[PDB]
Design a protein around this ligand. Structure first.
Ligand SMILES: CC(C)(Cc1ccc(O)cc1)NC[C@H](O)c1ccc(O)c(O)c1
Ligand SMILES: CCCCCC/C=C\CCCCCC(=O)OC[C@@H](O)CO
Ligand code: NA
Lengths: 454, 120
């Protein structure tokens, strides 16, 4: 066939899209215990019975958790069993033979879902498919219980029957590269921006201030963010797996936590710094020197290191459940599993405390600005909008994640992994958003223009 | 887009007193540092005397005890009291406003500059 380019029309990818891959035992929309790629264990409400059937199917004590290999094997077994189920049946086979490969895959999909007998139950629909009346069968299949229980999937299967093409599944592959280029743009923006900032502060002598000494730290954290964390994360998501080993996996995770913590805590330090610089400038200039500021930076990076490399490299962050053990054992797995202790501690240190301090400090500024030696002009509005951006961007980017990060560790399976990763990346873009917020000074402007010779 | 009106400078004998004054015409953020700098003949621009919007002040080590800065009620006008002048106080005095409108940094507003000559 000479076909080796992405997305070949078949039943396996279609079912992968319609079902999804979940290694731990879950409940479908109906309520039956399902595992892997749409593999029905049992109709019994008891989880122990499901574990029994699973252990019998696999051939070992799985504790409700199977590996990728076993999941794929079960998937293929169920597909082949569905096909043989079609061929054995007297109502399914005459229809199956009189279908193109695509519609054949649609039928195999239906049988894979609701079983041989169930699909054979569809007398009128199969009769219509047999006489090649695709649209009538499309209308008819939408009047079943199957369309009411799982409408999103039923629509795709029905559309596949009607059109005879992979239109309902072809669009799904576009979003992959579609978001890949977005990730690329993110990396480019972060790296370029932060490198520009660091270069600006390091090269020019007029940008050698304490505030800028903190900005340097923030830009460094965001730089290592855009160089190590974000690209490897993008590769991890796009390629579906991890090809660097457990050591580099946990090392990458360590870099992640370290950089995020250092970034946010540096934001906090900047907030406090500006508070003292604005409220009591004469004391701020005398007390806070460059050495003391560098000591502050060192302390922040130390605290960030204690909440990143220390617990992770020592495997203190590790969970105890079976899936976590399997992923830690698997060299190609780099999924993130933690206990309540590390999740809560890291969330409090990295985000929540700096959040509280920043809110309190900026509120102190906004409140103390109203009690100076002074008509509701435009300057106060502009300043309020400025701080609105400063706190607004940070909150909008990092709050939804650390909330989710604290909930997904309390009640199990309330937040889907997609949302977790997504919000984590919405946290990631803040690293790129920072150089646009903390570098708007005239000196920074002149530096930025002179650097690239605009 | 604000203006700074300086007034008070001029010729003065050694040991005499002089009063500088800077009026800020325009909208300035409530948190600011309004002060005076100077340029001596052949020397860099040095800070003379700055006052914070919160009342607190700050002076150079060569003018402390001789110079004293204050400000008006809400007119945003700053008055610099210069007593016991010296020949090394002969310089070009600039009025200045440090505005913390963007919080992260500070916008500087400068004056036209006034000449002060002390008769040696
Ligand atoms: C969880 C992860 C390491 C990204 C990831 C997502 C899904 C997956 O399968 C494997 C990895 N991102 C961590 C996040 O950036 C973070 C910052 C500061 C913290 O304190 C913290 O606990 C977590
Ligand atoms: C903002 C840009 C980053 C998007 C990260 C998306 C991760 C994700 O959704 O992974 C699951 C998908 O591959 C399948 O649903
Ligand atoms: Na692993």
């Amino acid at each position: 066939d000479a076909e080796n380019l992405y997305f070949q029309g078949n039943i396996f990818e279609m079912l992968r899209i319609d079902e999804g891959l979940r290694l731990k035992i879950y409940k479908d929309t109906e309520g039956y215990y399902t595992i892997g790629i749409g593999h029905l264990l049992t109709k019994s409400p008891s989880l122990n019975a499901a574990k029994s059937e699973l252990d019998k199917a696999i051939g070992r004590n799985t504790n409700g958790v199977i590996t990728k290999d076993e999941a794929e094997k079960l998937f293929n077994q169920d597909v082949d069993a569905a096909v043989r189920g079609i061929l054995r049946n007297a109502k399914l086979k005459p229809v199956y033979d009189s279908l193109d490969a695509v519609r054949r895959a649609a039928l195999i999909n239906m049988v894979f879902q609701m079983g041989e007998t169930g699909v054979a139950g569809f007398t009128n629909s199969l009769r219509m498919l047999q006489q090649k009346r695709w649209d009538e069968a499309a209308v008819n299949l939408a009047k079943s219980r199957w369309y009411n229980q799982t409408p999103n999937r039923a629509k795709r299967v029905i559309t596949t029957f009607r059109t005879g093409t992979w239109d309902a599944y072809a669009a799904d592959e576009v979003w992959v590269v579609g978001m890949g280029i977005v990730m690329s743009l993110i990396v480019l923006a972060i790296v370029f921006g932060n490198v520009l900032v660091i270069t600006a502060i390091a090269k020019f002598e007029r940008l050698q201030t304490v505030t800028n000494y903190f900005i340097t730290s923030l830009a460094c954290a965001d730089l290592v963010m855009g160089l190590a964390v974000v690209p490897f994360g993008a590769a991890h998501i796009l390629t579906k797996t991890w090809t660097f080993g457990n050591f580099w996996c946990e090392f990458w995770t360590s870099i992640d936590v370290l950089c995020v913590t250092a970034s946010i805590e540096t934001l906090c330090v900047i907030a406090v710094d500006r508070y003292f610089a604005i409220t009591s400038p004469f004391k701020y200039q005398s007390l806070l020197t460059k050495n003391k500021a560098r000591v502050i930076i060192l302390m922040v990076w130390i605290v960030s290191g204690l909440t990143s490399f220390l617990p992770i490299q020592m495997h203190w962050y590790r969970a105890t459940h079976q899936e976590a053990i399997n992923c830690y054992a698997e060299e190609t797995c780099c999924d993130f599993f933690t206990n309540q202790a590390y999740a809560i501690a890291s969330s409090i240190v990295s985000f929540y405390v700096p959040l509280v301090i920043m809110v309190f400090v900026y509120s102190r500024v906004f409140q103390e600005a109203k009690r100076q030696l002074q008509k509701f002009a435009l300057k106060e509005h502009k300043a309020l909008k400025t701080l609105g951006i400063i706190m607004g961007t940070f909150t909008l980017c990092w709050l939804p994640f650390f909330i989710v990060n604290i909930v997904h560790v309390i009640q199990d399976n309330l937040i889907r992994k997609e949302v977790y990763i997504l919000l984590n990346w919405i946290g990631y873009v803040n690293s790129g958003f920072n150089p646009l917020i903390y570098c708007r000074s005239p000196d920074f402007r002149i530096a930025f223009q002179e650097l690239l010779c605009l | 887009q604000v203006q700074l009106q300086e007034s008070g400078g001029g010729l003065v004998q050694a040991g005499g007193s002089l009063r500088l004054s800077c009026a800020a015409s325009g909208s300035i953020f409530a948190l600011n540092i309004m002060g005076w700098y100077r340029q001596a003949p052949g020397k860099q621009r040095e800070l003379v005397a700055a006052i914070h919007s919160g009342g607190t002040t700050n002076y150079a080590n060569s003018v402390k005890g001789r110079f004293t800065i204050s400000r008006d009620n809400a007119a945003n006008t700053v008055y610099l009291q210069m007593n016991s002048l010296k020949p090394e106080d002969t310089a070009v005095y600039y009025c200045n406003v440090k505005d913390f409108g963007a919080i992260i940094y500070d916008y500087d507003y400068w004056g036209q500059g006034t000449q002060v000559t002390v008769s040696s």
